[PDB]
From a paper:
Pfs48/45 is a relatively conserved glycophosphatidylinositol (GPI)-linked protein expressed on the surface of gametes and is assumed to be essential for male gametocyte fertility (van Dijk et al., 2001). Pfs48/45 is a leading clinical TBV candidate antigen and is recognized by the most potent transmission-blocking monoclonal antibody (mAb) yet described; still, clinical development of Pfs48/45 antigens has been hindered, largely by its poor biochemical characteristics. Here, we used structure-based computational approaches to design Pfs48/45 antigens stabilized in the conformation recognized by the most potently inhibitory mAb, achieving >25°C higher thermostability compared with the wild-type protein.
The 6C multiple antigen engineered 1 construct, or 6C.mAgE1, combined the 6C.sAgE7 mutations (G397L + H308Y) together with another highly ranked stabilizing mutation, I402V, whereas 6C.mAgE2 contained these three and two additional mutations based on their favorable biophysical characteristics as individual mutants and compatible co-localization in the antigen: S361R + D373S. Both 6C.mAgE1 and 6C.mAgE2 had marginally improved thermostability from 6C.sAgE7, with Tms of 72.2°C and 72.3°C, respectively. The X-ray crystal structure of 6C.mAgE1 at 2.18 Å resolution was obtained and provides molecular insights into the combinatorial stabilizing potential of its mutations in Pfs48/45-6C. The H308Y mutation allows increased van der Waals interactions with the nearby I393 residue and additionally puts a hydroxyl in H-bonding distance to D382, likely contributing to greater overall fold stability in this region (inset I). The G397L mutation introduces a branched hydrocarbon side chain in a previously empty hydrophobic pocket, allowing for improved van der Waals contacts with neighboring residues N337, L339, E382, and V399 (inset II). I402V reduces by one methyl the hydrocarbon content of the side chain at this position, alleviating sterics in an otherwise densely packed hydrophobic pocket made by the side chains of residues Y336, I376, I378, I398, and I425 (inset III). The Pfs48/45-stabilizing mutations we identified from in silico methods stabilize the Pfs48/45-6C fold recognized by mAb TB31F by >25°C through a combination of filling hydrophobic pockets, introducing a new H-bond, and releasing steric strain. In an accelerated thermostability stress study, both 6C.mAgE1 and 6C.mAgE2 showed no signs of aggregation or degradation, further confirming their exquisite stability. To better understand the potency of the Pfs48/45 antigenic surface that surrounds the TB31F epitope, we next used a recently characterized mAb derived from natural infection, RUPA-117, which has an IC80 of approximately 10 μg/mL and binds to a nearby but distinct epitope from TB31F (Fabra-García et al., 2021).
Numbering used by the authors:
A (entry chain F): 1 to 35, 35A, 35B, 36 to 82, 82A, 82B, 82C, 83 to 100, ...
B (entry chain E): 1 to 214
C (entry chain R): 292 to 429
D (entry chain L): 1 to 27, 27A, 28 to 213
E (entry chain H): 1 to 52, 52A, 53 to 82, 82A, 82B, 82C, 83 to 100, 100A, ...
The structure:
């Protein structure tokens, strides 16, 4: 029941320092012989290891990062942290914290692959400002119906930076949901839609609500989608 | 640094096929090679460690083998929920290094899209903007053409498309096309038509509506 | 307590021995492996070298050990410790404290050529390698 | 000398089933110095396990070894078709080095009686002074089969040889060829040449016969 | 990549000697031993001998003591095993395996094997006799036919049917060794009884050791 949970802002300006924290629960860092590391994944590309820290505070860095990475550990909070200095647009990426082993050549060391991962946090490097989304319904109608099936959804428009999360009925409705990749509009603001197909017969009896969260803006919107009788 | 050469970059296969992904290291990593499966929107998940041991709970159709410096990941019979990007990683020494990744594509039978259209909401019109959404649901293959006509005038430069990753159950795609106009432009026209071409359709289809009728 | 220059992979400290290097193998998961490395460097030795393993010991240490290699350790890597250190007067000792198995040897005098050897502690699905390097004078 | 006894000599199962092979030593094997080998026809043995329980490099997870003292076990958790082979155990704790007699792991199917065909010698061979009579047992299971030659209802002995194919990869059956070689003078002396076949698929021993010249 | 490559197949007369070679690569030859295992046709594995390239110590199974000797050439990383006074039960495949440096052990680094065949026979092409389909070789709606490949030496022969066009239902059997020292083999195929009067069937027998190629037509009756 070890769990890793990243935290930290989603937006950083170029030349600034990116800061993230990983909170460990279900076990103690100070009692562990493992190492606590960071791995990143720029959008649409592979995985790169940034570095790790032991519970003593000893650190180990990827030399290809040219000393831009600093890692710290706080055993009294069961946390460890990442600082990446002077970021550029190339540092926009998904950042993971993970538990893993050390390096062959160390005297007494656990050799292990990253097994427990955080969920990943997206950090966007840009000079643009945060903007919360507008949530609009995609109401079901005869023009979104086929057989005993009706499609509905929500349009999540004009937000920055990524990401937003969309659930339906607070997670109770998951089957048939399609939450599309966001598209960068001409305005520099993102837009996406999340749709779901449900039984047509349920449209008068079951309420359908999209739950939209944009953490960079601290916005939470619940939009009930009203069916149309036409 | 130890470099990991993973092959192939992309892999296309049908359900029930045997697939093999290889990884070669630039020097001895002993057997400290891991295989990860990354499904969409998820962190990479550890499948195999020490080149050939399965992580707890991994299906038996997954197996790994080695040959000194050449490592293999084999799925003995592909299933639809195997869709993911697979990565090898040496954990022998720092810095950790990963393979380039193998993106697994599932081949399946043709499936026509369900085509639905959504007029802009009244609330959006109040804010001064009109977005029209065309939905293509659960089709295969990915290639699909979606055009917009407004009062029989073909549109250009005012629509954007986005497509989902292959579904983990039926391996289909879905697509959404959004036509965006100002409120003023929207209210000067009546017919809003989404034009859809797909291999699964015997003829290109129109899904349309008249502004304000519903 | 006798001082053992070597690796203690068990959860309990012995009432008889103290080990220089320790990693509780019960603290790591099945996907983990332990590497424990000991380096002796003296003109002449008078040292107890050994291992404390809560599982199976591979090979028959310290009568036999593995000669290290850039390949995965295999039956043909088994050697006699006598031949590996190349001194004739090696005393071997074994002990047991619960499910902990203790294997030791005593090395006295100088070593003609720097040598290394490995012994494995396998506990169920997990393995811990103990590698000892012993220097010649210089 | 440490005698290793593997029982049984043949195991029969289908893909997906669990395999358990046994190796018993006449005395305890020192320090679990026991190895398991796999061998397929025409190939060198392949190391699967050493130290009783250490999986060799590049061997898939589904193979595991266990045991100590005089009793050791090789387990295949879910057998795959490529696993049908002969398996040898081996001890290297005491000289001389010894091997077990082997266990054949074989594909199991429903009992199939052999199709029995008999061929009299050819006219071209008889001109040379020898007569070879051939009897064919085709596509049967299991492999255990007995062939008897009867010349004028006189059981033959010491003048026939037989050979068996490896198990067919498609239908898991075997076939057997048995040649009876006589002088030509001895062949003209007699009339009825009979091939008597006993097999589990046959309720009664079956005889296929011909009359010389008919 | 540890690798042992063995010398080619040998045919030897009874009483003669044979020298088998095993060439190593991918590791330090002088840090290990070489272990020899033999497998008689259709039999199990038998430990034979061991040599330490490091020290020159040897060990032989009691059956082969004095009759078998070993030596190496370290500059070419080749280990040799010499067998004197070959008899007919020395016919077997001989494997070299990377061995322990200090005592007889073997592992998973095997050579591909060297077959030694002890025979008083000399090279001879086969005679190909038909196994003609008759009423005595029908089992319902199918018929069996074949070719008897008799009295050849040494192995192998290869058999195809209709120049490779006929593969389904073909069983080419392992050869048997007659008392004469010559091999003989059967190749059969099952085909529809419907095709006997209409389809032609030819076995293509190739004995490359004697450069014998025989195409034999097998007709009914
Ligand atoms: C913890 O830090 C010390 C330095 O104070 C270092 O010598 C030691 O190796 C570290 N422990 C590890 C790497 O397990």
């Amino acid at each position: 029941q070890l769990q890793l949970q990243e935290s930290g802002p989603g937006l950083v300006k170029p030349s600034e320092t990116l800061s993230l924290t990983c909170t460990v629960s279900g076990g103690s860092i100070s009692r562990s012989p493992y190492y606590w590391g960071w791995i990143r994944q720029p959008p649409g590309k592979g995985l790169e290891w940034f570095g790790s820290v032991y519970n003593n505070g000893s650190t180990y860095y990827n030399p290809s990062l040219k000393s831009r990475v600093t890692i710290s550990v706080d055993t009294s909070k069961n946390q460890f942290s990442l600082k990446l200095s002077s970021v550029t647009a190339a540092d926009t990426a998904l950042y993971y914290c993970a538990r893993h082993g050390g390096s062959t050549g160390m005297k007494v060391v656990v050799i292990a692959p990253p097994d427990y991962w955080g969920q990943g946090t997206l950090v966007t490097v840009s000079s643009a400002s945060t903007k919360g989304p507008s949530v609009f319904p995609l109401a079901p109608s005869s023009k979104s119906t086929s057989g005993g099936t009706a499609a509905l959804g929500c349009l999540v428009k004009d937000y920055f930076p990524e990401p937003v999360t969309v659930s339906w009925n607070s997670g109770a409705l998951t089957s048939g949901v399609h939450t599309f990749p966001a598209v960068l509009q001409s305005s520099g603001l993102y837009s996406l839609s999340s749709v779901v197909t449900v039984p047509s017969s349920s449209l008068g009896t079951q309420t359908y609500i999209c739950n939209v969260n944009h953490k960079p803006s601290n916005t939470k919107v619940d939009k009930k989608v009203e069916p149309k009788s036409c | 640094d130890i470099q990991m050469t993973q092959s192939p970059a992309t892999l296309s296969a049908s359900v029930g096929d045997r697939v093999t992904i290889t990884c070669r290291a630039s020097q001895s990593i002993s057997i400290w090679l891991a295989w990860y499966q990354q499904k969409p929107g998820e962190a990479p998940k550890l499948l195999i460690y020490k080149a050939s041991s399965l992580q707890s709970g991994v299906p038996s159709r997954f197996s790994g083998s080695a040959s000194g410096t050449k490592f293999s990941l084999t799925i003995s019979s592909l299933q639809p929920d195997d869709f993911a990007t697979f990565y090898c990683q040496q954990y022998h020494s720092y810095p950790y290094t990963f393979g380039q990744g193998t993106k697994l594509e599932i081949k399946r039978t043709v499936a026509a899209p369900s085509v639905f259209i959504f007029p802009p909401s009244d609330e959006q019109l109040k804010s001064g903007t009109a977005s029209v959404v065309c939905l293509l649901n659960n089709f295969y293959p990915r290639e699909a053409k979606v055009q917009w006509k407004v009062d029989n005038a073909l549109q250009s430069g005012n629509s954007q498309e986005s497509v989902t990753e292959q579904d983990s159950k039926d391996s289909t795609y879905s697509l959404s096309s959004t036509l965006t106009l100002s409120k003023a432009d929207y209210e000067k026209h009546k017919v809003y038509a989404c034009e859809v071409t797909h291999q699964g359709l015997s003829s290109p289809v129109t899904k349309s509506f008249n502004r304000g009728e519903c | 307590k006798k001082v053992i220059h070597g690796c203690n992979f068990s959860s309990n400290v012995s009432s008889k021995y103290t080990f220089t290097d320790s990693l509780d193998i019960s603290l790591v998961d099945d996907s983990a492996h332990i590497s424990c490395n000991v380096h002796l460097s003296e003109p002449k030795y008078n040292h107890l070298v050994g291992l404390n393993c809560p599982g199976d010991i591979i090979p028959d240490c310290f009568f036999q050990v593995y000669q290290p290699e850039s390949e995965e350790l295999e039956p043909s890597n088994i050697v006699y410790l006598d031949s590996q250190i190349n001194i004739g007067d090696i005393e071997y000792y074994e002990d047991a404290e619960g499910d902990d198995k203790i294997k030791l040897f005593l090395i006295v005098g100088s070593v003609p050529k720097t040598t290394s050897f490995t012994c494995i502690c396998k506990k169920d699905k997990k393995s811990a390698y103990m590698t000892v390097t012993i220097d010649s004078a210089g």
